[PDB]
Structure 1
Amino acid sequence: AFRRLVKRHKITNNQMLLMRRREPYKPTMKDRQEIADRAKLEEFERKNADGLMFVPEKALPPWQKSLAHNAKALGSRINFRGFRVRVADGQDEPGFPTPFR
């Protein structure tokens, strides 16, 4: 499903009449798809180089923040240390030791 009406370009050099592709130095469609996949995978690996940093309740996505806050506001109203609520949702376990942990 590509453009059947070919784009027209102002011909400044007579070799533009011969060239079919607009940017010949640009990789082909599937080649640049593979290139983008590889680059995004490398960026993701760089981002996950360090372990999964556990995050407090305020820096949570909206669909978890208020749930986790309400699940323990009752116990937080009474100031005493060592109270934990085992909420179902939240960050998952990494499975290995982490410097942030």
Structure 2
Amino acid sequence: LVKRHKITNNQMLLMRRREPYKPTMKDRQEIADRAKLEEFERKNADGLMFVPEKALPPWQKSLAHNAKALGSRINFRGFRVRVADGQDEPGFPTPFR
């Protein structure tokens, strides 16, 4: 059904849209998409930070830890396991790289 509303004057009777100052559905989608794109670009303004092992999502953290388990128990620098699930290479130099 249509959401009826308590009126405060005949202007509300003549009114069709409850919020005239609000963009229509298509303009809302356009504005939301533009805002999300701008926020994403602002987030990505800096390079892709190479987060450590402990900061990876739950489905990569344990795999990386198991891959590098032996090196953790036997400590010697220069040991890196070339896992597959790690973060993808960005392609350009970054401040964190």
TM-score by length of 2: 0.98
Q: CA RMSD in A?
A: 0.5
Whole-angstrom CA distance in 2 between matches of 1:55 and 1:97: 15
Runs of 4+ in 1 over 6 A off after TM superposition: none
Higher strand residue share: 2
Quote the offset at 1:83 in angstroms.
0.5
Number of residue equivalences: 97
Unmatched 5+ stretches in structure 2: none
Q: TM-score under structure 1 normalisation?
A: 0.94
Q: Which runs of 5+ in 1 are unaligned?
A: none
2:51 to 55, 61, 65: 55
Q: 1:76 deviation in Å?
A: 1.6
Structure 1 residue 46 displacement after superposition: 0.2
Provide the rounded CA distance (Å) in 1 between the counterparts of 2:37 and 2:29: 12
Q: Percent identity?
A: 100
